[PDB]
């Protein structure tokens, strides 16, 4: 089918939300490089700050699927999903109790140009007081592996995440993730993801943050040695 | 540190278990090369067959994670542990409420030979009398990317898995081990590791099993493209 997606894309965000009954709103635009699956977004927090909580649970809701590294081998359920675009919704639960929920609406914006707009909705509930989400206590996401799956005719994806903290270990998260296309595209095989996504830039209370992600897919381990 | 770890090692093995309250005891022989991660048991039903779910199940419980080609970069927790060796207890949680739980003590034999001996224990409920692993509708886990990360002097490894079912689609379980040597070792930094796991042949009841896995290391993508 016809693929409307080129090298260089532009993007434009708002997410509105609440972690733990506090509100905030916050702004980005980025680029990225859809075939290299790498892209680059600056946020700007611009109702709710300075946040109360680690600015690192919302960065995975900010940096789009369609900037991932896709061999020709495997089907690419997001690059087909254009112009039209597709929407994504996501449970991110914590090993303490703590538990996150976000959508994503990625279209095209109105004027024609080469930009994904994306309108994200985030809340968390049920974090610790005491916890690193609450204490603002996390370093960053270590690098991860998505595993993709379809399921009724849409893909999911799951992934074990983990927040490095301040002082060492980890604190983990699963994702479960379902992406939607909102048109009839070819679906893919079983197959993974690899991401790593960090906060490049930050000002002391996260009001402003730069955010860099690269990420690829494949099929996993060969067999063979 | 000195590691007794050699390029061709044996493997002997006895998993005693119970599933929905049905008892089995199944013995094993096989071969790996631990260097290279990759490894062979023929595995033989002694008790409780023909099995009456899915011997998918048990696979991952057969096919030790000292069979892993570990780069140099990365601290290998499994090699190091030996000849005094390690255990394993591992969760693994369906999507449907079944429930495994297994654990493995391996140690080396007793007559001093390149041999690792496994003493299995594995125990589920809750499967639905309907479900894939009763009806015996599954073909195969997929590769998966298995996340490890150290807590509390341990190492623990959790891993999103599917079953690819009779059909298509997928049945997904999620699989938190925690791995602990029986001496002080050097413990690693957050890392992955690939698996490619798959019966090579059986016998119409599952009494006769052969297994092979392929499994390596990594410390995921790096973020320049
Ligand atoms: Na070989
Ligand atoms: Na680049």
Same mark, same amino acid.
């Given at each position: 089918?016809?693929?409307?997606?080129?090298?260089?894309?532009?993007?434009?965000?708002?997410?509105?939300?609440?972690?733990?009954?506090?509100?905030?709103?916050?702004?980005?635009?980025? =680029?990225?490089?859809?075939?290299?699956?790498?892209?680059?977004?600056?946020?700007?927090?611009?109702?709710?700050?300075?946040?109360?909580?680690?600015?690192?649970?919302? @960065?995975?809701?900010?940096?789009?699927?369609?900037?991932? *590294?896709?061999?020709?081998?495997?089907?690419?359920?997001?690059?087909?999903?254009?112009? *039209?675009?597709? =929407?994504?919704?996501?449970?991110?639960?914590?090993?303490?109790?703590?538990?996150?929920? +976000?959508?994503?609406?990625?279209?095209?914006?109105?004027?024609?140009?080469?930009?994904?707009?994306?309108?994200?909705?985030?809340?968390?509930?049920?974090?610790?007081?005491?916890?690193?989400?609450?204490?603002?206590? @996390?370093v960053k996401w270590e690098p991860s592996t998505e595993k993709m799956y379809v399921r009724d005719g849409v893909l999911k994806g799951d992934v074990n995440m983990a927040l490095l903290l301040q002082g060492g270990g980890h604190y983990r998260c699963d994702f479960r993730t379902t992406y939607k296309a909102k048109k009839v595209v070819?679906?893919?095989?079983?197959?993974?993801?690899?991401?790593?996504?960090?906060? @490049?830039?930050?000002?002391?209370?996260?009001?402003?943050?730069?955010?860099?992600?690269?990420?690829?897919?494949? =099929?996993?381990?060969?067999?063979? +040695?």
């Amino acid at each position: 089918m016809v693929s409307v997606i080129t090298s260089e894309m532009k993007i434009e965000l708002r997410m509105e939300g609440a972690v733990n009954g506090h509100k905030f709103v916050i702004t980005g635009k980025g =680029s990225g490089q859809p075939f290299e699956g790498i892209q680059n977004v600056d946020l700007t927090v611009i109702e709710g700050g300075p946040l109360p909580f680690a600015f690192d649970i919302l @960065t995975t809701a900010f940096x789009n699927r369609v900037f991932v *590294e896709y061999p020709e081998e495997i089907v690419d359920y997001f690059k087909q999903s254009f112009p *039209e675009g597709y =929407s994504w919704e996501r449970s991110m639960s914590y090993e303490d109790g703590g538990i996150c929920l +976000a959508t994503n609406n990625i279209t095209m914006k109105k004027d024609g140009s080469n930009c994904f707009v994306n309108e994200i909705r985030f809340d968390g509930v049920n974090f610790p007081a005491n916890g690193p989400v609450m204490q603002r206590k @996390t370093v960053k996401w270590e690098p991860s592996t998505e595993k993709m799956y379809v399921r009724d005719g849409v893909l999911k994806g799951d992934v074990n995440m983990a927040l490095l903290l301040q002082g060492g270990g980890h604190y983990r998260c699963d994702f479960r993730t379902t992406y939607k296309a909102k048109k009839v595209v070819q679906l893919p095989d079983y197959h993974f993801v690899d991401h790593s996504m960090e906060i @490049t830039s930050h000002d002391k209370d996260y009001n402003k943050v730069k955010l860099y992600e690269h990420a690829k897919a494949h =099929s996993g381990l060969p067999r063979l +040695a």
